[PDB]
Design a protein around this motif. Structure first.
Motif, PDB file in Angstrom:
ATOM      1  N   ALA A  83       0.845  -1.236   0.000  1.00 12.86           N
ATOM      2  CA  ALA A  83       0.000   0.000   0.000  1.00 12.86           C
ATOM      3  C   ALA A  83       0.865   1.264   0.000  1.00 12.86           C
ATOM      4  CB  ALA A  83      -0.924  -0.006   1.227  1.00 12.86           C
ATOM      5  N   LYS A  84       2.181   1.077   0.104  1.00  9.90           N
ATOM      6  CA  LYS A  84       3.104   2.201   0.141  1.00  9.90           C
ATOM      7  C   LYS A  84       4.404   1.972  -0.632  1.00  9.90           C
ATOM      8  CE  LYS A  84       5.076   0.725   4.541  1.00  9.90           C
ATOM      9  NZ  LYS A  84       5.451   1.160   5.912  1.00  9.90           N
ATOM     10  N   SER A  85       4.409   1.019  -1.555  1.00  4.55           N
ATOM     11  CA  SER A  85       5.607   0.770  -2.357  1.00  4.55           C
ATOM     12  C   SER A  85       5.711   1.913  -3.371  1.00  4.55           C
ATOM     13  CB  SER A  85       5.485  -0.555  -3.108  1.00  4.55           C
ATOM     14  OG  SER A  85       4.460  -0.476  -4.079  1.00  4.55           O
ATOM     15  N   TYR A  86       6.850   2.013  -4.048  1.00  5.72           N
ATOM     16  CA  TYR A  86       7.039   3.062  -5.042  1.00  5.72           C
ATOM     17  C   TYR A  86       5.956   3.005  -6.122  1.00  5.72           C
ATOM     18  CZ  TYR A  86       9.362   5.838  -8.723  1.00  5.72           C
ATOM     19  OH  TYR A  86       9.727   6.754  -9.687  1.00  5.72           O
ATOM     20  N   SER A  87       5.684   1.804  -6.622  1.00  5.92           N
ATOM     21  CA  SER A  87       4.689   1.640  -7.673  1.00  5.92           C
ATOM     22  C   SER A  87       3.305   2.101  -7.231  1.00  5.92           C
ATOM     23  CB  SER A  87       4.629   0.180  -8.139  1.00  5.92           C
ATOM     24  OG  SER A  87       4.227  -0.691  -7.093  1.00  5.92           O
ATOM     25  N   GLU A  88       3.048   2.056  -5.925  1.00 11.16           N
ATOM     26  CA  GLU A  88       1.757   2.469  -5.376  1.00 11.16           C
ATOM     27  C   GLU A  88       1.726   3.947  -5.002  1.00 11.16           C
ATOM     28  OE1 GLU A  88      -0.141  -0.801  -2.764  1.00 11.16           O
ATOM     29  OE2 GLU A  88       2.001  -0.960  -2.297  1.00 11.16           O
ATOM     30  N   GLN A  89       2.788   4.677  -5.329  1.00  9.89           N
ATOM     31  CA  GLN A  89       2.851   6.102  -5.023  1.00  9.89           C
ATOM     32  C   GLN A  89       3.171   6.895  -6.291  1.00  9.89           C
ATOM     33  OE1 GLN A  89       4.519   7.578  -1.278  1.00  9.89           O
ATOM     34  NE2 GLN A  89       5.095   5.483  -0.717  1.00  9.89           N
ATOM     35  N   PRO A  90       2.193   6.999  -7.209  1.00 11.22           N
ATOM     36  CA  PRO A  90       2.317   7.713  -8.491  1.00 11.22           C
ATOM     37  C   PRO A  90       2.893   9.122  -8.405  1.00 11.22           C
ATOM     38  CG  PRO A  90       0.277   6.486  -8.419  1.00 11.22           C
ATOM     39  CD  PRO A  90       0.818   6.504  -7.011  1.00 11.22           C
ATOM     40  N   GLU A  91       2.633   9.803  -7.299  1.00 13.79           N
ATOM     41  CA  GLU A  91       3.127  11.159  -7.129  1.00 13.79           C
ATOM     42  C   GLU A  91       4.656  11.203  -7.118  1.00 13.79           C
ATOM     43  OE1 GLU A  91       1.576   8.981  -4.974  1.00 13.79           O
ATOM     44  OE2 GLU A  91       0.666  10.218  -3.417  1.00 13.79           O
ATOM     45  N   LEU A  92       5.284  10.073  -6.806  1.00 19.40           N
ATOM     46  CA  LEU A  92       6.743   9.997  -6.756  1.00 19.40           C
ATOM     47  C   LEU A  92       7.361   9.603  -8.093  1.00 19.40           C
ATOM     48  CD1 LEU A  92       7.204   8.076  -3.384  1.00 19.40           C
ATOM     49  CD2 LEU A  92       7.377  10.532  -3.802  1.00 19.40           C
ATOM     50  N   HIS A  93       6.530   9.171  -9.036  1.00 17.13           N
ATOM     51  CA  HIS A  93       7.055   8.721 -10.317  1.00 17.13           C
ATOM     52  C   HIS A  93       7.654   9.823 -11.166  1.00 17.13           C
ATOM     53  CE1 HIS A  93       4.189   5.004 -10.007  1.00 17.13           C
ATOM     54  NE2 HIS A  93       5.026   5.116  -8.992  1.00 17.13           N
ATOM     55  N   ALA A  94       8.697   9.476 -11.909  1.00 20.97           N
ATOM     56  CA  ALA A  94       9.362  10.453 -12.754  1.00 20.97           C
ATOM     57  C   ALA A  94       8.547  10.826 -13.984  1.00 20.97           C
ATOM     58  CB  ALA A  94      10.739   9.925 -13.184  1.00 20.97           C
ATOM     59  N   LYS A  95       8.575  12.101 -14.332  1.00 22.81           N
ATOM     60  CA  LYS A  95       7.873  12.560 -15.518  1.00 22.81           C
ATOM     61  C   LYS A  95       8.983  12.752 -16.539  1.00 22.81           C
ATOM     62  CE  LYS A  95       4.121  14.868 -13.033  1.00 22.81           C
ATOM     63  NZ  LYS A  95       3.346  16.130 -12.889  1.00 22.81           N
ATOM     64  N   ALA A  96       9.105  11.794 -17.448  1.00 20.82           N
ATOM     65  CA  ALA A  96      10.152  11.839 -18.460  1.00 20.82           C
ATOM     66  C   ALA A  96       9.476  11.609 -19.807  1.00 20.82           C
ATOM     67  CB  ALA A  96      11.171  10.742 -18.172  1.00 20.82           C
ATOM     68  N   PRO A  97       8.805  12.643 -20.327  1.00 17.07           N
ATOM     69  CA  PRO A  97       8.074  12.623 -21.597  1.00 17.07           C
ATOM     70  C   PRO A  97       8.843  12.145 -22.824  1.00 17.07           C
ATOM     71  CG  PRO A  97       7.603  14.613 -20.400  1.00 17.07           C
ATOM     72  CD  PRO A  97       8.809  13.998 -19.752  1.00 17.07           C
ATOM     73  N   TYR A  98      10.149  12.374 -22.839  1.00 17.58           N
ATOM     74  CA  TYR A  98      10.953  12.028 -24.008  1.00 17.58           C
ATOM     75  C   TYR A  98      11.988  10.921 -23.848  1.00 17.58           C
ATOM     76  CZ  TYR A  98       8.784  16.468 -25.061  1.00 17.58           C
ATOM     77  OH  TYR A  98       7.855  17.468 -25.249  1.00 17.58           O
ATOM     78  N   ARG A  99      12.004  10.228 -22.713  1.00 17.27           N
ATOM     79  CA  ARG A  99      13.019   9.183 -22.541  1.00 17.27           C
ATOM     80  C   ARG A  99      12.847   7.999 -23.481  1.00 17.27           C
ATOM     81  NH1 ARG A  99      12.991   5.179 -17.649  1.00 17.27           N
ATOM     82  NH2 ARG A  99      13.751   3.895 -19.404  1.00 17.27           N
ATOM     83  N   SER A 100      13.954   7.333 -23.789  1.00 18.26           N
ATOM     84  CA  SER A 100      13.913   6.151 -24.650  1.00 18.26           C
ATOM     85  C   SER A 100      13.561   4.938 -23.789  1.00 18.26           C
ATOM     86  CB  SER A 100      15.271   5.927 -25.314  1.00 18.26           C
ATOM     87  OG  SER A 100      15.174   4.927 -26.308  1.00 18.26           O
ATOM     88  N   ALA A 101      13.459   3.764 -24.406  1.00 16.14           N
ATOM     89  CA  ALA A 101      13.126   2.552 -23.661  1.00 16.14           C
ATOM     90  C   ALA A 101      14.216   2.258 -22.633  1.00 16.14           C
ATOM     91  CB  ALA A 101      12.967   1.366 -24.610  1.00 16.14           C
ATOM     92  N   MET A 102      15.460   2.579 -22.980  1.00 12.99           N
ATOM     93  CA  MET A 102      16.588   2.374 -22.068  1.00 12.99           C
ATOM     94  C   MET A 102      17.325   3.694 -21.922  1.00 12.99           C
ATOM     95  SD  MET A 102      17.977  -1.401 -23.035  1.00 12.99           S
ATOM     96  CE  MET A 102      18.894  -0.834 -24.445  1.00 12.99           C
ATOM     97  N   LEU A 103      17.721   4.016 -20.698  1.00 13.01           N
ATOM     98  CA  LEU A 103      18.372   5.297 -20.443  1.00 13.01           C
ATOM     99  C   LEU A 103      19.809   5.418 -20.933  1.00 13.01           C
ATOM    100  CD1 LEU A 103      16.819   6.054 -16.970  1.00 13.01           C
ATOM    101  CD2 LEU A 103      16.090   6.908 -19.207  1.00 13.01           C
ATOM    102  N   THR A 104      20.309   4.345 -21.539  1.00 12.60           N
ATOM    103  CA  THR A 104      21.637   4.314 -22.141  1.00 12.60           C
ATOM    104  C   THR A 104      21.519   4.810 -23.583  1.00 12.60           C
ATOM    105  OG1 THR A 104      21.187   1.991 -22.629  1.00 12.60           O
ATOM    106  CG2 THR A 104      22.678   2.469 -20.787  1.00 12.60           C
ATOM    107  N   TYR A 105      20.288   5.099 -24.001  1.00  9.60           N
ATOM    108  CA  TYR A 105      20.023   5.605 -25.349  1.00  9.60           C
ATOM    109  C   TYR A 105      19.468   7.020 -25.275  1.00  9.60           C
ATOM    110  CZ  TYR A 105      21.358   1.429 -27.747  1.00  9.60           C
ATOM    111  OH  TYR A 105      22.114   0.392 -28.272  1.00  9.60           O
ATOM    112  N   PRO A 106      19.664   7.817 -26.340  1.00 13.17           N
ATOM    113  CA  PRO A 106      19.163   9.192 -26.308  1.00 13.17           C
ATOM    114  C   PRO A 106      17.664   9.370 -26.214  1.00 13.17           C
ATOM    115  CG  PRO A 106      19.616   8.631 -28.552  1.00 13.17           C
ATOM    116  CD  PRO A 106      20.171   7.474 -27.681  1.00 13.17           C
ATOM    117  N   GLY A 107      17.259  10.340 -25.401  1.00 10.74           N
ATOM    118  CA  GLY A 107      15.855  10.669 -25.280  1.00 10.74           C
ATOM    119  C   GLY A 107      15.486  11.422 -26.549  1.00 10.74           C
ATOM    120  N   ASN A 108      14.196  11.653 -26.764  1.00 12.83           N
ATOM    121  CA  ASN A 108      13.773  12.312 -27.999  1.00 12.83           C
ATOM    122  C   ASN A 108      13.841  13.838 -28.001  1.00 12.83           C
ATOM    123  OD1 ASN A 108      12.739  12.914 -30.481  1.00 12.83           O
ATOM    124  ND2 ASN A 108      11.001  11.490 -30.353  1.00 12.83           N
TER     125      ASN A 108
END
Ligand SMILES: [Mg+2]
Ligand SMILES: [Mg+2]
Ligand SMILES: [Mg+2]
Ligand SMILES: [Mg+2]
Ligand SMILES: [Mg+2]
Ligand SMILES: [Mg+2]
Lengths: 299, 299, 299, 299, 299, 299
Positions: F1-26
């Motif tokens: 009831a309090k894991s990261y996945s259950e706390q959307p407000e803590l989630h990162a807003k990364a509109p342009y990220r790629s599938a893997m962060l080792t690759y360029p975002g858009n």
């Protein structure tokens, strides 16, 4: 007809190297051999510049040992590991490695041993108990309780040893590695008879500088030359204790012409050059001579 | 009554340092002063060991310059930057920095300049055009098109200059920095008259080793001494070209006793010691002497 | 009776090592020997992880060569130098070093050679002129115009060579070092007959990935298996050109069971494992198997 | 319609990650969940190669944890910090980090915790007092006296926590971090009942190698297989103590097919691959197979 | 007429620097001078980013001191040494260096001192005995038993001192170096009267964060402002103890406008900016303002 | 009831990220979105301090981009790679990475791209041909001839992409990566109409400093304010060319309050803070204020 294997004159003479250069060479035997025949006194170099490139340059001159100072040398952990490997690999096993470690740093000690150091110098030794704490950490059971590292070798791939059925090189480590207490305080000198008599040790070193400071003697204060009598007595007590117990002395030679006298005094491992001071004096002296020779062109 | 400021005898003598030690000292003027009075010929040290700790040891001996070799020295970018800073800061401005860069590496060049190098040696120069490509990258407009770095200083905080209204140290850079072509090939020697006559240059250096290889001469092959005549002619053409155009020669001294002869030949910047070979020979020689002196104890 | 020298079974078998491990082993002869007897095809490992510790682990497995990728491997200059030294020293000369360099980076090339690389792979080769530019930088005169580094050795101290009167190891370098063009573009394949016929080259490598992208072929797009015909034709033209000119092929084996077929095709230097992909697949596969085997405990 | 946020199948599954990946994930809960459902036993990888690039490759395979060995792994301080960050960030929180620290090194411990390690393995544990010294340094008051670092976060900018009003992540640290004593000596085994009963611990690990050496047992000396009875008894006492107290066992799997048996024995965190030995064996094995397959071409 | 020496306005004002910048400046006197005239209270910067480049940027702003945190800052050994050198050299002696060391790490301490740190802050001090252990390691005999390093200077070449016949800079070290206990626990506060009365100390620092955690006080929990009374009492006891014994307080200023109040409270060394939090807040704030100002363009 | 996945407000807003962060975002789309809605103008930070720790601190403030300067920033190859990875991973994809590379350094370029940079700024652009040379190296065929690296991913293990059947992320690279010419010379301004019209570019940047030097204008020489007319004309020609061709301008904001005006002028990517100058000014200013406030205590 001209490959390396066909040119014996080019082969390395490494009398004490282990089966693998990632393991310590036999400093224990090298010292015994030097005691039996002092013409074999180990001539090495002190290494305080924290650069593996420098270790490689030193190793290429083929010293009998490279003495790495971790008590006061600015070596990081990985760099210390790499310097020890470089000393043994770039001399193709001819240069044994001795490391002076910080007195209470277990990580410096395990790093030095895991990398292949054949000798450990313990600074500021004043009691037999301090030395036995190092015995515990330096040797595997039944001698001590040194922890066995899994990352130093690879089972069935890179695990060669000079000893029979010694896949983990436990015999290599317990038979090749040496402990050298360094006496450099008034209390150390006062208890040197007991320290020198320890069956566990393989060498003894004196620290003139720290001793003089601790003794309240004017370091570099010989008005008309002639060292302070208190220092003379200290060195006499130290050297006599080492000699009576059959312990070779480890030390440095301020000038290479001091070697014969040091050997007569019982030294069997002598650092005949120091990288920091040696390079400094070489360059400073060359600059002075050059400028002096240019004065004739003034005007 | 005993602070540093109250003890002038301890103050650094840095005749050519800039307002900030992150900027190049005035090698341009140092060379002109040495030409006017050869007793002031710059005596420096060649630095090929990629270690800023070594740079610090060299800088403490106060050479007139530290010659850093990036063409063949294994310096990483940041480490080169740090070595240049260390040379100037640890000598408190007394040691100017000269850097021999890879012939076509723009990053090595900008790094050396941005860090404060006062001289750039260009290897394998054969044409005036090759030198002018360096002029373009080494100096700011109107002289060249060197790119201005924003990270070397801090506006209104760390931007001091010896020149008036020079907040960006553009004057410092264009007035202090020197270009030194290195002649080390048959084609280079054949075109040395033209290279030596370039108004843009401030020094000339010869590369005996590379020249001999390129000329097909047995490097280190003087049967009964006496260098090859082809080499003698090459050096004569080179030195005469430098002398006639009022260009000082930059070079090294195999032995410090060669300095007077080099000065007579027109050298005004001489590397009198080399860190790699110097340390190697010092240690190897000490080891040899030590072992030799121990032979009397055999048996 | 038990020293290393007295235990021949422990001695390193390094058929092609130079007098000093800081110099390149004889890859030229190793390739000729593999051509004469394909059972001697060189089996090596590709190294893309920028860590000298990894190089040491790879060297301890005694591969016939370590192929270091500087075109795409994140090796800094000093670290590249150290990795090359580590490969040769930690394999005690058994592992020759081949380096794929960035196509136009002179510093990467000189660093690789100065450190002891025995082979240089040139990416994206499309013309004979591009290869000749590397010949100029890779070999000393009279073959090329490679610059001689003073910091790689120490005159009279560390300058051994397998060749007579070769104090500077110029013969070692010009006789041991190999050039391997890599064909990986449509234009490269179109001009492979000319490239393969160059007397200066010692090997040929294909770059399937870059070729497929350049050819507009769906990399990893074999619907029902069977590579694209355009690729098949390209490989046929490439392999036939190498074979007709007596040039061995250098390549990788996706799976070790491909080795016999590759040898039949003319490959004489095969990378049979890749550190990055190999470690990744090993760990990922072990994790998958472990988790799968734990499913029986659910509930 | 195709951004990352719109492609849930690509999202990371990180059940135990903290609000920020610079903080430890919840290993405490992961272990409890594995105890409740053994099919969730954590499958991880042991990391002894001191290279953050390697950590990144390992993290990309998404292990349940990366076990970093600082007792014997040559990680410098900053590099350890970077490796811990890389493990958690490059696995996007899926890989928890466990660090085995040197037994008496406070700096290694604080570095591991400050960087985000969720578990600490203490080597050579023999007394409950030794474990309580770690409790004092590992947890903030009221549990211990761990020192709070100001540089790990930024007030009002980067200080997110899964817990309410926990701006300093004190709750995160005290609720997520685990202590795992490692039993690897005769005295440790003799006192395992007491150690296993400590309310403060969250796991138990055995050190077979160090134990065998300390017990005087021939490590790797199973004549006809079958481990020494003294070892069997030791493991039985150890495993029974862990099981009776509800403590999960942490260990390694020599071969992945051992996993089911280990789970049956109570292991809930298993390292199924080791980077150093794994890479070594993979490469050595591939080389052997390749050379063997080439023998058919001899002659 | 325009050289650096001829432009006094450009000269560095470094009232407390030693003869050589590789040695500690006189923090002892700086503190006494600030006590005599509080307008001279030392204003410095806290440095927790492990980057010597950052140290150089900080040093160029000419703070009265750079406070390096090794207890929680991720500085490797060599990097710590280089940061200390950079702080003093890039500020040309104007910035003294204070280092907060891990409480039990002898290597961090000797490294900080050997590199030139003028002040050592000891965390979590609770007893006079803990402070005396630092006195033993920080000062040479007759005051303590600090070990003398040979690599920090070069006899007859680089050994200048402000003191007479002090070739080893023993006087410099024993007269310039300061000890500052940090009180940050309930037990520390309870015994502050005794700690503050030690004749050996030169300053006192409080650790609000660690204290609050240890005291069970809601750090950053001032509902309607107003710090907890228990904290107020603790700070009162601490400050009164320092004041009555003539010990200056060392601390940080959350906001620069707090400086006058801190000086009135007895602070004579104040860190007015912190590199990590300062940079973080500067960038985060600029981003927020920028985005906010862009909202007017929506639609 | 309090894991990261259950706390959307803590989630990162990364509109342009790629599938893997080792690759360029858009960055391509981010720029198009900012052009469509200028309230979305990208606000970022310029990064010239060669420290990945600093990159991590900057990334934690969540800038829209981190602009890394390799033309003048002292980043080594591996460190550049690590900084790019850190920017994207520590911002969890919210911070795109733009790298200004040295104009002719292929290795800096491939390193930046292979590590995940989404934008490349080309300094000193004067011709369309110079830009097309970058297009060739920056994009895979059919657009260019960029070489594909095998070490950036792991087939079947770590190869996720936002695009269909894109196992090699060729689509990711060719669709996300941007080219930004920098105009900073008289010739560049004279040919800006042609450069701005190139279909291949995605942004345009001006270099005021280099331009002013090249134009012979007194940089920082506005007697009574008001920039030089020649500069005004240059900026007008530059901005009008960008605007007419639908190319967003990239630039810096001397002060954050300039943002609205810059947006009105067509800037859609603005660096609102610079790490080196920002930290320098913050610390210098705090020191000045502190000392000034202490003057009241004089006497
Ligand atoms: Mg001593
Ligand atoms: Mg040359
Ligand atoms: Mg390719
Ligand atoms: Mg163990
Ligand atoms: Mg604290
Ligand atoms: Mg510019």
């Amino acid at each position: 007809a001209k490959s390396y294997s066909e040119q014996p004159e080019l082969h390395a003479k490494a009398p004490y190297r282990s089966a693998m250069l990632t393991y310590p060479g036999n400093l224990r035997q090298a010292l015994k051999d030097a005691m039996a025949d002092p013409s074999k006194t180990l001539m090495g170099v002190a290494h305080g510049i924290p650069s593996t490139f420098v270790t490689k340059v030193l190793a290429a001159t083929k010293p009998d040992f490279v003495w790495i100072d971790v008590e006061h040398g600015m070596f990081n952990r990985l760099e210390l590991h790499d310097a020890i490997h470089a000393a043994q690999h770039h001399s193709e096993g001819r240069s044994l490695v001795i490391v002076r470690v910080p007195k209470h740093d277990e990580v410096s000690l395990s790093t030095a041993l895991d990398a292949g150091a054949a000798g450990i110098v313990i600074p500021h030794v004043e009691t037999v108990e301090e030395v036995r704490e190092f015995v515990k950490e330096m040797y595997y059971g039944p001698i001590g309780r040194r922890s066995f590292s899994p990352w130093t070798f690879s089972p069935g791939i890179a695990d060669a040893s000079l000893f029979p059925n010694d896949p983990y090189n436990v015999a290599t480590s317990n038979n090749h590695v040496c402990i050298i207490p360094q006496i450099e305080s008034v209390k150390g000198v006062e208890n040197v008879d007991a320290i020198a008599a320890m069956p566990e040790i393989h060498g003894l070193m004196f620290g003139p500088g720290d001793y003089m400071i601790d003794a309240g003697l004017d370091l570099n204060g010989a008005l008309s030359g002639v060292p302070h009598p208190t220092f003379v007595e200290a060195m006499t007590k130290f050297s006599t204790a080492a000699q009576r117990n059959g312990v070779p002395i480890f030390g440095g030679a301020l000038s290479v012409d001091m070697v014969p006298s040091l050997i007569e005094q019982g030294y069997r491992a002598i650092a005949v050059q120091f990288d920091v001071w040696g390079l400094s004096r070489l360059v400073h002296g060359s600059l002075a001579q050059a400028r002096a020779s240019a004065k004739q062109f003034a005007g």
